[PDB]
């Protein structure tokens, strides 16, 4: 008989392993502040991981990688990506970005304008985009002096990386879009990729003369849902899945979802876990870690696949919840604190 | 990777290695607390010792 | 040098305390006659904990045997180990006290407290330094419950930063002498929660069903339910009277046990309880299984009712001590919504190489849990069906006493139950 | 030569400082009647190892220490121990009866009654000190003399000897290998009133200890002697500059200029390697760089912590045995490459290295195996500050039901004390996050 403690009640993806779990008649659920549990499924932001592995005789285990954080905020990441020789400045598929302190507050102000200054005169396409981890608040802008006035404005950390001006649009439609990459790391580190992702279209046309209209350039669900017209015109929800995906890529490019994508899927994911590995590895800790990634993504017109951002605390797509939080059980909960396929994921073997 | 001031004796010998630079109350406050504290609890006894005479 | 000071009052506290001295008698090797005849230095380390060292090498207990009237004494002085306590130490009375609370504390009673006094003052003046006294006594009688508790108060007023610890047998209809049990253990628990440190509550209800159901005995004697007493008796004082870690005194035990003064009325509990199947080698996961089920308990009181404050467990004998934290802790991490969570790690475990006579091993269970509200419970319920009719009061009324005092008794009583069940919350 | 005072109080002050003398005397070649065959100089001399041993006219070399206990069944085992002759009667104090697990008792109403006996007989050693550099002071964190007594002795130190040094070993509170629910209390209340008098205070995790016996020693269930055995061999590497000749960490004061740049954040965490079993058939014996490596492995340190996560202020490398500078800085080169190392900028990022080719002792018949050579690296890391998180939090789960409150205020404390002290720990972990975190 295993415990678990609950400390994070806006999570449907542990809201659903937490039914699984209870549903086995092998676990039991105790006061969030008991610290006699075996598993911990974790509140998003402070926790408290110095507390974990020092009760006589439990084996304990949570579900965050203390340090990832590293991965998933906007400015860390850039700067773990400039400073590791693992990925290097050199970083092919990652974009140009650049860490922008707000004139009110290191800083890579004067880096950014060179880089600008050096496009500008190149005639080439100089469209960037502005963002920040304490948003919903995005700009995107081909004039340097618009991206850094609307950073002044703000008071958090922000970064500007170039905008992808040449985006693969699906047909029909003329429309833009990114994939979701699932991604488990368990207490061994073994990098998990569920088989399963889904692509958040833009049920608009991608308009490259009007940035105005954020619309038809973001490919968040709620900007889709809440201020496009065309919701739900192709697919359902504006998310299609791999099985379909990979028809479209084989009628009209000729290519499978598996050679012209998912292959740089999997080195950006094992790039990047296996980059802070060192730093975060719980093998030798007195408590075991494992974490659910939500890795995004962006695909140009040539099939180069760009790394967007990392989600510590990502969602699922409503009809995939089933499938992947067993899997989570199995793989991750399961392993630590065995019960009474075929396997749903791909491990990425690495060098550990 | 800089090494200075090595020191060598007979027994063993030390040295620094550098990789990068950088960028109260007195006698009597005490025996105040004490007499302190052991006046609260005669205090306290006195009172358990009128309860019982009660 | 860590002296305790028994003290045995009334028949109830008399039987019990006989027996207690015949079984730690004869783990320390000390026989009939005060002569040491054991095989092992273990059993002389500690035994001036409870032993006076007489003159020859003789052992005399450091035992007072109070009683209002001659009968149970002469028994002891007659009865196994009678020849063993000090005769000075037998100080009694003629005319009885007639389960009557009132002529223990306050008539019959008062015209012996003194002269016991003196003899708890000889003992203690003998004592490198004295731990405190413990005290066998029932509650539903009147030599024991009503002068005992007159004793209590007037030791505190002496002694009074000593430790103060009883066994108190608790009343119940179902091995009953008298009506007036409940009048009796009213007034009395109104003294403990006063004037005692610490008191292992001891249901002789429960030990009647122990004897009944789980050791088949068709028809169980105040003797088979003594024998109950004894071995949990020996087991609770086995980290006094033993080389034992931690030291083990009387202070740190209540300072670990106790997290609120009114709050020192313990749950005792034996493994293993067999019928005679009785050869069998007991392995620690049954220790530990019985140790924590409510049947292996003295207060006859749910453990799951409510939920433990803290936990004290001794394991005797040569055992697995690595399988015992692992039971332990499985028994903790497999039930811990019986534990409350606001006092970090408050199951504490305890190894005694030395087991009782018989056994290759045993364990013993103190619990200070809040489902010993329910033996109040009981005792408050049978008190008011008789009080709101004033039945039976006569008898105390006629030794001076006023309504008044039951009244302030039964509120102080409900009182520590509301304050049991705020903590269970 | 300057002096040093070693002063043990309580239960484990007592005992590991049992263990600590024992193993300076084989490390000294001195023999348990007090005899040192190689000091020439009889009946005096200002050698190294006489910052901690004076000599009679005789030729006995006597410890420069003090055992303080409120209860005497501990101190009784040095007074008729192997090292009885070791000690003469003024060093060995024992009170009547203990604290009973209550810093308030340990140290408003037994302390006060013998605090001016412990002050004289230490007067006394100090009277034969040319030139005392200052105290090293052993004690429990949970017990009630060792919380208790110590802060109080401490305060007591800083009146009379305002211009002394003071160092602490102490034994943080391990549930595993303790019986008392109230250590919580009692860890907090002593690091309140005891933290403006100590310089440096290396704390030791009786959980670390005791999970370092179980792995590396194959103890299933381990005992004091076991534990003690172990905390003296980092004590001694801690004190051997001490009593060697050498350059780093010569005197007291060094400990605090090496490791302490703030008053307050004054706890080093230790790590030690190798730990090696005496049962084993036998062993590989491991290098230099694979004993330095060890000592950024959670699982050598005296204080379970992830210093992945937390920033250095100082380190400083101890080695022990067949050790020279060429393999200390490769090792520290494939550190830097491998290693989460993250130093605060406004320290230099760097490590102090001293090397003492004389191997580690051990005690005959005892657990820990012969080593050619082995390390004891001390460094200040925030991460560190786990160990007040788990104490605060553990006190604050009692403390809002005022839990066991009651025997504190019973022997004259007033609660106020309780939040004051709950208080001054808050302070403390912001101070540990403001130089931490970003
Ligand atoms: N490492 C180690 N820890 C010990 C030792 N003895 C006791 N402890 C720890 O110290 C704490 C208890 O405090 P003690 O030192 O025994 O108590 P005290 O200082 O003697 O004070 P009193 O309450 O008066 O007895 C517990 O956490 C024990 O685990 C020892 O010999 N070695
Ligand atoms: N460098 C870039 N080039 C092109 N498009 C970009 C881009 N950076 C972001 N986008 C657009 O913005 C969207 C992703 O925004 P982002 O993920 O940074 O915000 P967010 O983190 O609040 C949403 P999520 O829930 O996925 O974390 C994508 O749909 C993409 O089209
Ligand atoms: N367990 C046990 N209970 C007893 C014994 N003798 C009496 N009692 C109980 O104690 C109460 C009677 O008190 P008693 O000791 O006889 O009165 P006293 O002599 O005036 O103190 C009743 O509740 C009895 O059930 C005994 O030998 N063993
Ligand atoms: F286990 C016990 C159960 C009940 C009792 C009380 N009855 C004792 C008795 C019975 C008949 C004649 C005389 C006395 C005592 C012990
Ligand atoms: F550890 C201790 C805890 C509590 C106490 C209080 N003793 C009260 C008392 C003394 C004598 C007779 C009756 C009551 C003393 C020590
Ligand atoms: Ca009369
Ligand atoms: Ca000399
Ligand atoms: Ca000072
Ligand atoms: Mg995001
Ligand atoms: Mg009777
Ligand atoms: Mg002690």
Redesign the pocket.
């Known amino acids: 008989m295993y415990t678990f403690v609950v400390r994070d009640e806006n999570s449907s993806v542990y809201a659903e392993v937490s039914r699984l779990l209870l549903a086995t008649g092998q676990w039991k659920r105790l006061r969030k502040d008991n610290p006699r549990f075996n598993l911990m499924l974790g509140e998003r932001n402070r926790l408290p991981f110095g507390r974990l592995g020092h009760e006589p005789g439990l084996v304990q285990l949570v579900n965050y990688y203390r340090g990832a954080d590293k991965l998933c905020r906007?400015a860390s990441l850039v700067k773990l990506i400039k400073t590791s020789p693992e990925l290097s400045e050199s970083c092919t598929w990652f974009?140009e970005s650049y860490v922008i302190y707000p004139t009110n507050l290191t800083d890579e102000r004067e880096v950014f304008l060179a880089a600008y200054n050096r496009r500008r005169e190149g005639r080439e396409g100089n469209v960037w985009?502005a963002?920040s981890?304490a948003?919903?608040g995005?700009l995107i802008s081909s004039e340097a002096s618009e991206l850094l006035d609307f950073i002044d404005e703000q008071g958090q950390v922000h970064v500007i990386?170039?905008?992808?001006e040449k985006?693969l649009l699906l047909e029909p439609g003329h429309r833009?879009?990114?994939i979701?990459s699932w991604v488990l790391v368990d207490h061994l580190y073994n990098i998990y990729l569920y088989r399963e992702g889904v692509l958040?279209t833009?049920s608009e046309p991608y308009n490259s003369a009007n940035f105005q209209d954020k619309t038809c350039?973001?490919?968040?669900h709620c900007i889709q849902k809440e201020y496009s017209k065309n919701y739900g015109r192709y697919e359902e929800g504006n998310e299609m899945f791999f099985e379909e995906f990979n028809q479209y890529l084989m009628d009209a490019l000729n290519t499978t979802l598996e050679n012209s994508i998912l292959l740089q899927i999997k080195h950006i994911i094992r790039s990047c876990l296996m980059c802070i590995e060192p730093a975060i590895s719980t093998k030798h800790l007195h408590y075991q870690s494992f974490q659910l990634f939500?890795f995004?993504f962006?695909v140009d017109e040539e099939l180069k696949v760009?790394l967007?951002?990392v989600?510590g605390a990502?969602a699922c797509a409503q009809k995939l919840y089933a499938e992947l939080c067993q899997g989570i059980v199995d793989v991750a909960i399961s392993s630590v604190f065995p019960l009474a396929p075929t396997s749903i994921f791909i491990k990425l073997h690495h060098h550990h | 990777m800089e090494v200075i001031e090595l020191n060598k004796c007979t027994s063993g010998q030390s040295f620094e290695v550098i990789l990068k630079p950088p960028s109260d109350p007195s006698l009597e406050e005490i025996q105040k607390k004490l007499e302190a504290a052991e006046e609260r609890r005669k205090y306290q006894e006195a009172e358990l010792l009128k309860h019982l005479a009660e | 040098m860590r002296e305790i000071v028994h003290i045995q009052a009334g028949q109830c506290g008399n039987q019990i305390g006989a027996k207690f001295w015949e079984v730690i008698s004869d783990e320390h090797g000390i026989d009939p006659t005060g002569s040491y005849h054991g095989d092992s230095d273990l059993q002389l380390e500690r035994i001036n904990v409870y032993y006076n060292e007489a003159t020859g090498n003789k052992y005399v207990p450091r035992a007072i045997l109070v009683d209002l009237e001659p009968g149970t004494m002469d028994s002891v002085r007659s009865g196994p180990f009678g020849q063993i306590f000090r005769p000075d130490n037998f100080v009694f009375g003629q005319s009885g006290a007639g389960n009557n609370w009132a002529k223990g504390h306050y008539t019959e009673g008062a015209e012996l407290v003194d002269s016991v006094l003196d003899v708890v003052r000889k003992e203690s003046e003998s004592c490198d330094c004295l731990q405190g006294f413990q005290l066998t006594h029932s509650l539903g009688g009147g030599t024991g419950s009503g002068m005992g508790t007159l004793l209590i108060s007037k030791i505190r007023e002496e002694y009074p930063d000593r430790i103060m610890n009883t066994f108190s047998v608790m009343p119940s209809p179902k091995v009953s002498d008298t009506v007036v049990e409940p009048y009796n253990a009213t007034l009395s628990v109104h003294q403990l929660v006063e004037n005692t440190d610490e008191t292992y509550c001891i249901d002789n209800e429960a030990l009647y069903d122990i004897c009944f159901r789980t050791l088949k005995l068709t028809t169980p004697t105040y003797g088979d339910l003594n024998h109950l007493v004894s071995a949990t008796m020996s087991g609770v004082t086995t980290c006094l009277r033993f080389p034992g870690q931690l030291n083990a005194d009387l202070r740190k035990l209540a300072v670990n046990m106790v997290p609120f003064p009114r709050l020192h009325f313990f749950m005792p509990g034996f493994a293993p309880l067999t019928s005679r199947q009785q050869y069998r080698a007991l392995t620690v996961p049954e220790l530990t299984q019985q140790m924590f089920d409510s049947k292996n308990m003295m207060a006859a009181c749910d453990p799951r009712h409510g939920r433990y404050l803290t936990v004290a467990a001794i394991f005797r004998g040569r055992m697995s001590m690595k399988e015992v934290d692992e039971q332990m802790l499985n028994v903790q991490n497999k039930n811990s919504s019986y534990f409350v969570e606001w006092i970090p790690n408050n199951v504490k475990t305890a190894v005694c190489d030395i087991p009782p006579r018989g056994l290759k091993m045993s364990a013993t269970f103190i619990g200070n849990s809040t489902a010993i509200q329910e033996l109040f419970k009981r005792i408050s319920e049978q008190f008011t069906a008789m009080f709101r009719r004033k039945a039976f009061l006569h008898w105390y009324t006629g030794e001076g006493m006023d309504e008044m005092e039951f009244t302030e008794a039964e509120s102080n009583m409900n009182d520590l139950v509301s304050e049991y069940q705020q903590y269970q919350d | 030569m300057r002096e040093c005072i070693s002063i043990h109080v309580g239960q484990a002050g007592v005992q590991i400082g049992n263990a600590c003398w024992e193993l300076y005397c084989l490390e000294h070649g001195i023999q348990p009647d007090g005899q040192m065959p190689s000091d020439k100089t009889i009946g005096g001399g200002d050698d190294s190892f006489n910052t901690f041993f004076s000599e009679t006219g005789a030729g006995k070399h006597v410890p420069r220490a003090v055992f303080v206990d409120l209860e005497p069944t501990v101190i009784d085992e040095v007074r008729t121990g192997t090292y009885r002759q070791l000690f003469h009667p003024e060093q060995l104090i024992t009170g009547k009866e203990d604290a009973a697990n209550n810093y308030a008792r340990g140290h408003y109403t037994i302390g006060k009654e013998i605090i001016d006996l412990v002050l004289d007989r230490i007067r006394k050693l100090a009277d034969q000190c040319t030139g005392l550099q200052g105290f090293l002071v052993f004690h429990s964190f949970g017990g009630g003399t060792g919380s208790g007594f110590t802060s109080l002795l401490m305060e007591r130190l800083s009146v009379d000897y305002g211009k002394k040094s003071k160092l602490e070993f102490s034994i943080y509170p391990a549930p595993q290998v303790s019986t008392a629910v109230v250590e919580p209390y009692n860890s907090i209340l002593t690091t309140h009133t005891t933290l403006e008098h100590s310089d440096c205070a290396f704390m030791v995790d009786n959980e670390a200890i005791y999970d370092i016996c179980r792995r590396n020693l194959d103890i299933e269930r381990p005992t004091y002697t076991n534990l003690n055995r172990l905390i003296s061999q980092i004590v001694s590497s801690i004190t051997a500059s001490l009593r060697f000749d050498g350059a780093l960490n010569v005197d007291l004061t060094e400990f605090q200029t090496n490791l302490v740049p703030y008053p307050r954040i004054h706890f080093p965490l230790a790590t030690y390697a190798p730990v090696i079993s005496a049962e084993k058939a036998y062993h590989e014996q491991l290098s230099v760089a694979e004993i330095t490596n060890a000592c950024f492995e959670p699982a050598n340190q005296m204080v379970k912590c992830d210093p992945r996560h937390g920033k250095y202020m100082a380190c400083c490398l101890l080695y022990r045995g067949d050790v020279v500078p060429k393999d200390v800085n490769a090792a520290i080169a494939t550190i830097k490459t491998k290693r989460s190392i993250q130093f605060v900028d406004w320290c230099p990022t760097g490590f102090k290295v001293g090397i003492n080719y004389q191997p580690p002792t051990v005690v005959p018949g005892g657990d820990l195996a012969k080593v050619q050579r082995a390390v004891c690296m001390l460094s200040n890391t925030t991460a560190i500050a786990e160990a007040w998180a788990r104490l605060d939090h553990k006190f604050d789960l009692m403390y809002a039901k005022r839990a066991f409150v009651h025997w504190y205020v019973g022997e004259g404390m007033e609660e106020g004390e309780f939040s004051e002290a709950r208080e001054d720990m808050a302070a403390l972990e912001k101070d540990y996050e403001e130089v931490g975190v970003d």
């Not at chain 1, 990386?161 to 992808?164: E, P, T």
């Open positions: 906007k974009p985009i963002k981890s948003g919903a995005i990386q170039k905008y992808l985006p833009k879009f990114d979701r958040r833009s350039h973001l490919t968040n939500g995004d962006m760009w967007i951002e989600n990502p």
